[PDB]
Each structure stands twice: as structure tokens, then as C-alpha cells.
Amino acid sequence: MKYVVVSGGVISGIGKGVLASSTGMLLKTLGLKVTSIKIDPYMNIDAGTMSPLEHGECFVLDDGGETDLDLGNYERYLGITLSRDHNITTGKIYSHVISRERRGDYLGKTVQIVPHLTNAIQDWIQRVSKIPVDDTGLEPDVCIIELGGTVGDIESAPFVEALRQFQFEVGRENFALIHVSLVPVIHGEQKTKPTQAAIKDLRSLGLIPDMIACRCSEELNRSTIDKIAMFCHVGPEQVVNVHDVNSTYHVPLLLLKQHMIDYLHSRLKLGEVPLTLEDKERGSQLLTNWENMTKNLDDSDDVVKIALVGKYTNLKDSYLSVTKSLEHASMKCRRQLEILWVEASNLEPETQEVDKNKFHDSWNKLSSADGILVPGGFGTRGIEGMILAAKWARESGVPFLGVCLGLQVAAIEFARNVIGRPNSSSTEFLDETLLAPEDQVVITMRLGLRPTIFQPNSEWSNIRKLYGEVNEVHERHRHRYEINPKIVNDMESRGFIFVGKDETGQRCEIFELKGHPYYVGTQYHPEYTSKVLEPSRPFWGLVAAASGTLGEVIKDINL
């Protein structure tokens, strides 16, 4: 087992998550089996309790774990499945040793942060890195650890102490440290004192960096490389840079151009790892596929515009799996994507009195779009604006996908306007008044990977053809509210077909509307099962439908 810590810097926004995911995928090009662990200094047990306004969305695993967003970067670059154990936190590990001290496994000893908590962290990392995470039976060859927060924040102290010990409690040449660090530019001169201070803060904790990975708005000067490589122990080829490029898929090839594998191939002795003839082929094949999708982003120009309608769209981190799911679906179509970020509340007619500027801009953006997405996220702000987007998309025949809350919004819209029930509404917020036209109801969560069964007549639907006309689908759920199953037959008779349901019925999971080119919704989040070469099927439907060629996509999928 090899370990690669990706760590620290001078700021919390530095973009470690891209570099960790990219470093792991580059190791996967050698054919190595790879896994990864995110460490969070926060005291929350999970990202589930904490609101999307901080650290972006929670990400859902097959376990039903509501983990930190960074686990999604690993799953979509590395192709692996992660467990709720792969997101370590301060909350998890203090809860673990405190529950263990009350149970008494420490034999009446005094329990202390060193050695007992730092040995508990090292036991967690040793257990969790040996969980098999590919579909194959094998234990991973390499583990990427991403150390969240910044080095020398008091929040991090047990993890920087544990990782010092770990560099010896596992062999050297089985452990290596990448430090990620800020190189700000002032008056056009590339200033280095922030990264020199961060390299000292690592040495103060006994962590010694094997590569320094600069984050900068420029190519590093050869003087900027030398002034760091002379201050730190790293050689000139071990001062990595990652530029402020928009395409995060280019980062693996920007690291490969900087010869970063050729250092880790020595520094971790990756030639001593045994590999089969299948492994080297499936490794090199994966690199050629990534050269092709990045070539397609360099030379595809013909924009498809998708409008994304939701709360707090200024927090673009709040929708990162949607963004990445749309980008995978646009690459599969060989088309460039624009996302138009529509703050759903500004669509509402009250905005035309309160701030007439925001009203006209938000309705410009929505009218402009070749297809529409309503992305999910609980909370009562802007839902009539999201209902207005679903209405516009139904009436103007514009491709629509509704994910989680977006499906319920389309059901409420179709009830208010096509069934003509003018006060039909979500149970989430009006039930203090005990309303009879319930569109949502409660059914304390439904979470993680679940089976959807396609209902027997559904063979016609564009969405069931996108799932290869298979009878069942596996996707990740997260909801407490679902469509009222008393009203379902009214919608299924008026043409809004609930194409798929849970095994028990009375719990709707996919709809497609008869008489529209692509108007679809899902109760699950299709984003989380997206992979770079195999996009999320409902999103491959939406981004093909917006472009045209949805028939040719379905004809392809029938091979």
C-alpha cells in the first residue's frame, strides 16, 4: 500500500481537491488500483446536517452517507466507489475515541491526543485505504489522502501530528507529501514569501514535502521555481505549478507535461508494484480516452446553452455535481456548454416591483436557453420562480430536467396549470393550514443507492431508452418528501407518466411527459453517478435534446 498526502498551503480556497483527484487519475494511467480519503478538520460528523451555503453541496455515497463535496471529485476522476468511512473528520474521530474510552478498550489508561487519538487516525487510514473501491475484488495499490483546512490551523493539529507518525508507522517509499501553496503576483512580480512560510510551518510539525505545488495566475518564472527549490528540499522538477485554466480536465495533462508521474514513479517505487498485462492495457487505454475528451474541449465550438434555475446561484460551489454532470453530457455530445445561472426568486412577479433590473435579466436568461434544469435543494425561497420555469419549459416545448425538488416543482406546476388545481402545493411549508390538494407528502430520509423499477407500459419513453431499455436502474436518493400517490393516477391519465417507482410502488422516481421532445424529472440525484467517459443518462438526454440528435443518441445506446 502506497500513500500520497496532498496538503495545506496558505489559504482554504487553494484547489487541493482538483490536484488530489488529478494526481490519483495519473497514477491510474499506470494501471495501479487507486483509492482516496478526505480529512476535514470540522466537528460535524457528516456534511448532511450543514447547509449548502457553506462548503457547497453535501455529496451522497452508495452507503447513504451525506459526505463532504470533495469525495465527488474522487469518484468522478478515479472511477471508484467511496464509503462513509472515506470522509474522516474531527467530529468522527473524537466521537470514536470518546465512545471507546467510555466502553473502556484503553484498559483504564489516561487517554491523550498523542499517542491515542493520533494512533486512532492512523488505524482509520490503514483500515479504510484497504477497503476495495473498484468493481474488481482487489485491494488498492495507492491511496491519496487529502488533508483539509490549512497547516498550523489549531483545528488540524491531531491530523498533522498523526501524519508525521504515519510517515514511519508505514515505510518511506510507501508514503509521500505534496504541499499545495499560493504564489501571489503583485506589480507583475511572482512573490514567494507566503509559500516559504507554509514550507516552514510543515517543517515545524516534522512533515517534509516531496513536491511543492504552486497555485498562481501565471506560468511560474524559472527564477520563481529556483527561489522556491533553493529554499525548500524539493528539486526544480518537484516544484509543480497548476494554472488558473477553466477546464479542470486539462490539469492531469498539465501535471503530465510537468513530468510529475516520473518523480512519483521513483519516489514511491511504483515499478516495484506488480501489474498484469490486462492492467497495463486498461491503464494506457484510459490515458488515450482522456487525451480525446480534452482534444474535444480544445476544438468543439458550437454552444448549447442550459439554464440552471435555483436558490443562491452566486454560490456556484452549491451545484458542483450538476455542473460536472452537464459538462460530461456536453462532452459526450461533442458540444461546448454554457450554463446560465438563474436565481429562481428573480423570475417571480414581485421582483418586477422590488428590483425591475433583476426581473428582466433573469427572464432574459431563462428565455435564451436551449434547455432547462431545476437542480434540487430544500428550502422555500424561489419555489414559485422554479414553478414558472417548469411552466415556461412545458408550454414553450423547451427541454426540461427536474432533479429532486425539481421533479416535485414540475408536478406542482402540471397540477396548478394542466389539471387546473390553482392552490395545489408542497406539504413542506403550507401544512400549518392542513390543505387537501397535497402534491408532495412526507414518506426520517430516503438515502443512498436504491433500485428504481420501470412501470410496465414505459417502453416508449426517451428516458427509458436512455437507460438502454433495462427494466431497473440504480441511482442515489436523498429526500423526505415525495409525490402524493393518491393524485398519481390523475397525472398518469393527463399524460404526465410516472415512468418509474420504488419496488413497493406508492413512491415515484422518474417521470416523462407524453407530448414534449424531452420533459423529464427524477426523485434521485442523477448527478452523483456521472463519470467522465459515461455521463449521467438523464443529463445525456437533456444536453442531447437541447442540441438535437436525441434519436441518434438513443440509436447509439441500443448497441
Next chain:
Amino acid sequence: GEQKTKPTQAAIKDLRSLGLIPDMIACRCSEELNRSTIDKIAMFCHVGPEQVVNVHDVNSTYHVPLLLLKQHMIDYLHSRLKLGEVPLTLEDKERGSQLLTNWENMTKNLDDSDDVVKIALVGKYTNLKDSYLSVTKSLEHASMKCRRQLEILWVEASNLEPETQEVDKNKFHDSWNKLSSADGILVPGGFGTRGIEGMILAAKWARESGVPFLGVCLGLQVAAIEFARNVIGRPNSSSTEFLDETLLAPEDQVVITMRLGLRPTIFQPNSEWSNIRKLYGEVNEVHERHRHRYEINPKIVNDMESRGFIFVGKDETGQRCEIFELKGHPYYVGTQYHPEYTSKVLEPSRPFWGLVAAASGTLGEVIKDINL
């Protein structure tokens, strides 16, 4: 336990619906037909009682001709096709009846030979036993010529690989039990990258433990890769078929869009010593069926021929290797052609008659016989 007839009554109607009228009905069943099962079909269909044939689920497919002859099936076609009106010469009737006596003998030998030779067949998808039917029949012809019963041990080549010992430790130990058990080893061909290190491990085991080995098509290239990795000590030498995205210099295979059908192999001039050239009667040339796009790198051939892995035969042009035999092993051989396809019941495929004699012992007496 009751022999149900409605499926065959429906199939006889489906023939009449197309205007095809059956002259014999040939039942396939797990039993002898009851005389009631014959009558209930012969009363429904136009066929007489002697025109309801049965063929039983016997293992020996060579017994079927004599099970049809016991059911008097020739004596119907001799009338129904008027085969007495066909003119035949005195040579024809002799070479006809002689052929029947030879078939009575080989079937008698399968009834009364008991002393098993075990051959391990190492390959992809061995659960699909139809995937290797000419290998199976070539081994059975070679075992009958030796007057010995055959077991084939079906080794899924991937399960030999050390990753299996982590993934499913049961399949690892069983596949290595089967390979260790065998009196001789065959690597059968078939393109595709699954299990090739497992096939390399079988070639290694057979070279080192001195156990008879035959490599057919991919099996020859696997033995060349094995001998390169382990006896020449080139640790990353490999097939061009799958690593060439990385442009590797130690090419064991190369491309040379197919080479197909019957072709001449010429034995290279020094090759008179080899058990394989003695099995081909010490004739200078051999005719066998090819099927490949990849062949041994002819730049590396002199290294193998100096280290003792002699490419005993090549194409007329050279630079295209077709038979090897290794100096210093009782029978370690490979072919680029498929020797299976030229096997016949009375005249088995020579490389396979070599393998199944070598496993049994008596390879010298086989070669002494062939010299007559």
C-alpha cells in the same frame, strides 16, 4: 420418468405446414425410447417404426454411427435413396468395408482402454466447452491412437494469476491443483488479453517441471514471452497486441490483415534431432492451417535459437516462425498454425500425437512406428 411426445408432434406439424415431409424422425432423449414411445410417434407421423431413430446421451460421439447401424438406419436409406442403383467399383466396396472395420476397432478400444492420461487445457472462458471442440477432438484422436483414455482438465487461465488469491482464494487453489495434477499441458489459442499472464505461468510451470507442453497459435507466443521473461531474463518483454500504446522496445510479438488457410512450413536445415520433426516423418515440409495477425519478432529469434528454444520451422520467406521445439525437455513444442483442424479419426494431428504420447511415455516407440 414418462417419455413425453407432444414437442415432436408439434415439430412434425411445423414441417408439414412448410410442405417438407420427413422420411425419418430422429429422437434426442436421455433414455432408450419405449416401444410405446416409438409407436405413439410412428402412428402420428408418416414414418414406419424402423424410421423412428433414437440417439442416446452417450459421452462417446464415435459410438453414434454404430448406434444408428444397430437401429438399421442404413437399411432404410439403401431403399429410400435407391443406393443399390449407384454404380460402385471393386476398389470402392473394399475401401468402404475396410473403413467400417477400422471404426469397429477404435470404438472397441474406447470400451476397453482404462489407463488415464490427464491433459490440462489452459485458456479463456473454459466453461464454454464448445469454444475448444477441435482441440477436444484432436486430443481424443491422439489418445485413441495411443490406446489410452483421456481426461481433459479445464483450467480457466486467469484463475492461475496471483491476484485471484486475494479476489477469490477458492478459484486460485482449484486452478493450481488442476494444473499440477496433469501429465501434459496444452495452451489452445484464442485472441484477447484476459488471463495471458496465467497462460505464461502455465508455460513456466511446464518448462521448469519438465512436463509435456504444446502451445497452439497464442500458446506459442505465450511460451516465447515466458522463455524471454524467465530464461533470457527480459522482465518486461511482452505481446505487441496490447501494450503498444506505450511503444515498448522488448517486442516478443509483432504484426506481420491476416494469414489464413492451408500454408507450407519449411523445416529449417539443422532440425533433424527434434521430436516434432520426427513426428512429421522427417519430411522437409508440412501443410497445416494458419490463422493469425501477430508473429514472433524475427529480430529476437536468434537469441532464442542460441539459448536453446529452436524455431524448428518457418514460412518459405523466413522471418515468420511456425514451429518451435526446446532443446533439453522431453516434449516442449509450439505451433503458429492450428494443428487441430487437420486431425482425422484414424490419422491424428502429429503435434497432438506427440503431446499425448509424451504425457503417457512411449514417445520413442511412436516415432519408431512413424519411421515405417
Next chain:
Amino acid sequence: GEQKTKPTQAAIKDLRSLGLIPDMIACRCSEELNRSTIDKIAMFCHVGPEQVVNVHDVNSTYHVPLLLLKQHMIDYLHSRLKLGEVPLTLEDKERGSQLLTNWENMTKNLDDSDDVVKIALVGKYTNLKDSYLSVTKSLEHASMKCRRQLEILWVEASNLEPETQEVDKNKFHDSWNKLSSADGILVPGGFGTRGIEGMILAAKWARESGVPFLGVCLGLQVAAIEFARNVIGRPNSSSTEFLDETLLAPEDQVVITMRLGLRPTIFQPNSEWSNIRKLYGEVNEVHERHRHRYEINPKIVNDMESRGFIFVGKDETGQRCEIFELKGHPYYVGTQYHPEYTSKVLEPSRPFWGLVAAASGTLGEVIKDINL
């Protein structure tokens, strides 16, 4: 089927003839004694019916204490030796009764554990199963600590050697079946030149197939010779014990007139990573019993330690290697000492608890436990 008593009546007379008078008669028989068999002995001898003990031919020798306790044998000696007159403290009675409950548990675990781990033991004269009794008992203690049943597969090391495939082909195939079958491998020690290439072949197989290996005394030197012959590629490197009439330069063993009894091993400074040093609780030193005249050539040690065969522990003086673990294998270990002799029923020998956990899986959970 009748339980004959005249041999024991004659043995009871032979005791009286020397003036020795038996207080209990302990029968050894293939059955429960009949109550007539007890009475016919208790009437001939001075012993009462409860002083005619039996011990049955059960396989589990750990059941014998509870079979004697069921026959109330303590309740006789508690009178006949007046053991109530011996003074005992309150700690003594607790540590006494605690020990009985621990033995009830390990015997309960042998009654209800079913999930076999197979260890192959490779050596000279394995038909003499008494020749390896501390190995056998050390493996049984290590399997009980894992809550798993043990099979030992007794592989006569010489039969693995390729000369056996000519001399007696039956013994060749059976010995290689047994070795291929096993979840882990032990090379047990014992001087003498018979079968050592067969033991080298078992060490090779275990290294290459990634199968757990423990080499004890000669078994460590065999693994060093194997790693030298095949991974360093020194084809004639060998034991000084038997070739030194030819004065060979590639010495793997050398003489260093014995080293005997309990000695200290010091773990070398970098060794914290090793499964074997974790099994010894990450303590800096180990106390174990030595018996050898030959040891690893300390001139060649840095070559092995650079190629990944780490001599994890040495004598206080250095130049005398005592534990190795190989980088890049789940559990490939050897010891110069005999770890068997320090095994105890509740506290198994650490290298053997490593081997029998490694074969089963759960070696991490064993090491996590030992860290408490």
C-alpha cells in the same frame, strides 16, 4: 469387540514385584471402558472403581484434562495427596480457577470451529509425525487463537524435486498437489542434505504465488538460498553445509560449536513497518530459543536488504541474522531461532500466529489487537 485385561493385570503384578503400589490405574484403549472392564481391574488391583482412569483415543489432546476431570480424578488426588493441607492465598485460588475457565473456552472453540485453514509443512521424514511435534502444537495454538480449525498437509520435501517425476511419478504429483492446495506454507528446520532443493522449490512457489511463508532455522536459510538463486540470479549459490569440499565463492550459509538456548534478538532500526515486528508488539527486543551452527553470510546481507529481503532482526553483535521479512508479500518471514518452543496454549508463538492469521486473512485485525 471384548476389552481384554490380562496385559494390565501382568503390568500391575510387575509393579508389586518391585514394591511400587499403584494409587490409580490409567487405561489406554480405543473405547470407553465397560463397567465390567473397570470392575475386573478394580477387583484384581488395590485401586477403587473411581481410581481406574481411562483415556480414549480422541484426536484433541487438549480434551484429556477435561476427560480426566469428568472421571473425577482431582477428587481422588485431593484426598490421596491431602492437597487441602497445602496453604493457598486468595490470588492463588483466583488465578487457578481463571486458568480452568480459559481451558473450557479453548476446548469449546475446538468443538464448534469448522472453517479450515490448510498449512503445508514441507520437510524430511514427514511419515515420522513425532519429528515435528512442537511445530504441530505451535500451529494448533495459533489456529485456536484465530478461532479456526487446522489441517496440516505433510509434504515430504524430496518428492517435490523433478527427479521424482522419473523415479516415482505418483509421489511427484501428490506432493505438488498438497503444496498447491495450501493456504500457507511452513519450512520447519532439521539438518541433513535430503530434499533441500524440494524445500527451495516450496520457498520459490510461496514467494512467486504470494502464499504466506514461514521458514524456521534451515527454512530461513532455504528461503535466503531461494531468493539468491532466483531474485538475485546467482544460479549456483548454496549452503556451506555440504558443497564446501569444492570451496564455492557464492556462500549463502557459513559456519559461525553451536548457538543454543534463550538469546536476545535486537530489531534493526528501520524495521517498524514489518508484520513480524508488529506481531512482537513493536518491542525493540525479542527472547527466543536458538539451535544452529550455520547462519547467513553477512557479506551478502546488504544485497538481500537492498533487493527487499530485509533482515529485520540480528544478534546484539550484528553479523548474525535472526528474523527476515520480505518487502512486497502479505506474509513472507523466516527465523533463525525455533519460535515453536516458546508457544503456550493461551499465548501462541508470534511468528506462527502471523502465519495462521495470514493464511486465514485478518492479519491486520490480529496486529490491531496486539497493539492493545
Next chain:
Amino acid sequence: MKYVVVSGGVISGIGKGVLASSTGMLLKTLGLKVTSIKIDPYMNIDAGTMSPLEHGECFVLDDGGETDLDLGNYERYLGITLSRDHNITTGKIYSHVISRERRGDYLGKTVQIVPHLTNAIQDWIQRVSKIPVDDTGLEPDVCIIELGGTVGDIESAPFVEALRQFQFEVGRENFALIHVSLVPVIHGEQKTKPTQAAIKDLRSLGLIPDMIACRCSEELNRSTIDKIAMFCHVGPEQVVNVHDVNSTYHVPLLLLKQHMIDYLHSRLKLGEVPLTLEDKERGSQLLTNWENMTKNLDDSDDVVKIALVGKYTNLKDSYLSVTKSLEHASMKCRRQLEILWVEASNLEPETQEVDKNKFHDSWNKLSSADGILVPGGFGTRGIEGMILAAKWARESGVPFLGVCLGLQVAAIEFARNVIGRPNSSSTEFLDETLLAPEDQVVITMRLGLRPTIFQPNSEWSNIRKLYGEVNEVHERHRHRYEINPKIVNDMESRGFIFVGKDETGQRCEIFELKGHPYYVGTQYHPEYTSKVLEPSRPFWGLVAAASGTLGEVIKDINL
């Protein structure tokens, strides 16, 4: 009224009768009132004329109808009473329309197979399914129709044509089709072309299957399900399998595990049928009782052996109600049953010359048994062998039950050997010689449900205690011969007490012998009144007596 046709396949031996009975009982677990109809393509009016060597025994209804054996499967799984009208045949319905055309109800029209015979079949099914068949007053909610023979046999043509019309002459969602079909396995691969051809033969007649029920020696592969569900209109959950398990009582729970109710609950809209609070309780209670008796067959091991002595025992279908009556009686005792099939003729001393092997085996089997049954069935073969079994059972004190001919055989045995009348015999076959020691006499049949009155002194008998010490019993008769009532007082004085008789006397119906643990006979067939939870009392006596605990059984029955 709902209809469920169970139909067809590729072969006549396929086991529709178990699947029809099991499907009906599963519908009864919902609390629905259920009924069923067997259709036979044969030209016999009844199974009474036709010999037991074909289609097994005739089954007797309360009407005295000698119906097809399959009606017994329905009565014993569903708990219902069937009338002679519930077995439809070609003979019945052509006799009906031909007698109706000669009477002239068709008003001088030309009468044709379509529409007149197919409308007569549809009128029969509509009349007969509305006959009340539970003990309660209600008309059935659901009817199971079992279509006998195979589809596209010319024998079946009027019934496959009638059932096409019936799918419309009754509403869809009030009719559904189960097709039962053969999935043979060759070289371990599950071949599907026979069932694809049978699904085409249904479509050729316009019958469209709602479920395909495979009969196979294996679990279906998921590929075997998909390759059928892709060829036919049925969804993956509508490809049912029934495995070659020995316990036919497990089939209801194997269908329930395959979620077959959850399809029919939609496809027949069984939630629209009104049900009372008693109905749902007595429905769910019935399911728990069936879970218990099947659990008892999984975990009862302590075998009771019963020897069954009769003609043609190689035809095990000839004794199916005996077999099922013994299995109900062994389950009530919580004991596993072996039946030992003794061909009665092989017991006879002539066999020891003719084939000495068959002699020794048949006497081994009879000597081995914990109890003995002589099962009935007319015909002169083997009767001295059956007399020898009755002798052995009387003399060795081994439990004996004689049913119909088996009672007369025990009377002949007791006369030949205990009264010592060496030539006393059946009137059935010697009366060409006009013998005075008549044991049987003729008394043209006595058929159907009749009253037995217990004779006044009979309170002591194990058999009258098994009938709860009630004064009268209701059971199904079928005989032309009975005990000579002139000789009855000789037997009643020598200890062979005729415990019960017909209301008129001179017609004996139950005997029990004084001075044996359980030696009993019946003139009626007790098999036909057996039910899964309430076994036939004479058989519950026999199988308790063989096991021991006959006193505790009688003590229980006194509650």
C-alpha cells in the same frame, strides 16, 4: 367476478394443477372468496367411465360426480366444495348443444362451433363461477379456470376460441391469463425456443398472456428471464418460475417470494373488490397457518413409514388423494412420511416361482412399515396379496386402514383366517360358480356425500373418538359391493365390530377390531374430505397410531 385462466404449455404433464390451486390459495390470503373450473378436452362426460390407468383416479364430489382428478387439488388447497358442473369437458358441452339443437332452443338457425358452442362455453363459465362454493352464502370474487390439454391441440379448439371471446364478453381487469410452459435444460444451458413457440401459439388464437410460468429443473438465470421477457409482452416480474421441489405445499410461498400477488393485485384491480374486517383477518390468519405447516416440513425429521398395498403402484398418480391425505395426517402429527409402494400381486406366493426378486422386495417393504393402508380400486388382480397384507397387519398388531375394497379385503381375511371359512370370498368375481360363503354382495352405484350413523355400543372405538364421539359422520361413497349383512353378526360376535352403518342398516360403512391398537376400515373414501389444516380422521388415526401418541390425539380432539 374476476377470472384467472391458467393454461397450455408445450406438454400435457407440465403441472398446471399445482399452479392453479396455489394461485387460487394465494388470492384467498387476501380474504377474497374463490372458486375454480377445470376444462378437459376429452370426450368423456365424466372421469367415472375411464379406468384409473389414465389421468390417475376419478375424484368424487359431494354431488356423486366422478370428476377429473384436478378438482381434488382445488378442494384441498382452496377449502371449497365443487359441483359436477365445475368439470367442463368436450363431451359435456357437445352433448349440451346437440341436445339443445334437437330440443330446438336455437329457433331453426344453423348451429356452428362459433358463435353457438363458444357462447355455450361462455354461458357455462358465467353460470358455474357464480355458484357459492364456501360454506358461507356469498358468490365468489375470483374464479381460476384451468385449461386442460395443450394449446393448438385440435381437441382444445372450441375452448381456446371461447376464452378469446370471454376476455371481452367479461371486462379486461376482470380477466387475466397465466401461461405455463416448459424450459428444458441441455448441456446445463436453459433453452427457451419451446416456450417462445408456445407464446406464438397463444397469439395465433388471440389469447395474450399476462404471466409466463416456467417449469424447469433449476432457478431461471436472469438471462433466461430477460430472453423470454424480451420476446413476449410480459415484464421481468411476470416471468414466473416453479422449481422441481418435492413439497407441493412450498409452491404458494415460492410464488409469493416471486411477488406474483403484487402483479395480480394490479392486473385484476383486486383493491377495488370490497372486503370486510372479518375477511381480511380470516385471510391473513390462513397465510400464517400455511407458514407454520411449511416450517414444520422444513424441520420435522422423525420418519413414520406407511406401506400402501395395491394394483399398478408404478402409476403414483392413481393414488393422489391417498398420498395427500397421508401427508396432511403426517403434518398434523409433526412427523415426516415415507410411503412404501407395495404392488399387491408381488406379495402372492406364485411370485416366488415367477420372479423371486419381486417377491422378496415386496415382502421386505411390507415388513418394514410402521402402518399399512389398503387404498381401494376395483379389479381382481392382486386381491390375495391384499388379503395377505391384511392378515400380516392383524396378526403382527401393526396399524391397518382399509379404504373401500380394503375394508372388504379385511372382512374376507378375517373370515378366511379368524372365522376359518377357507373359501369365503368376494361376489365380484367367483359368482359364475354361485358360492354360498359370500363376503361381498351387490347392493347401479352408491355415490357422493352420505350419512353414516354410529351403531349404539360403539363409544369405545378409537375411530369414533377420532370423529369427536359425534353420533353421525358425512363422507363420500363410491361402491357397488358391500359386506353380506347375513354374516355381519358373526364378525360382530368374533370382535370385528361394524362400528357404523347407513341409516337403513344392512349396509356397513366403518369397522374397528376389538383387541388391536388401530385396525380399522371404511366403505367410503376418507381421502376426499381431507383438508390441509383438518386431515381426514381415519388417516389421522392411522398416522398417529403408527407413530404412537394416538391417545394424545384423541385427548386433543376432545377439546
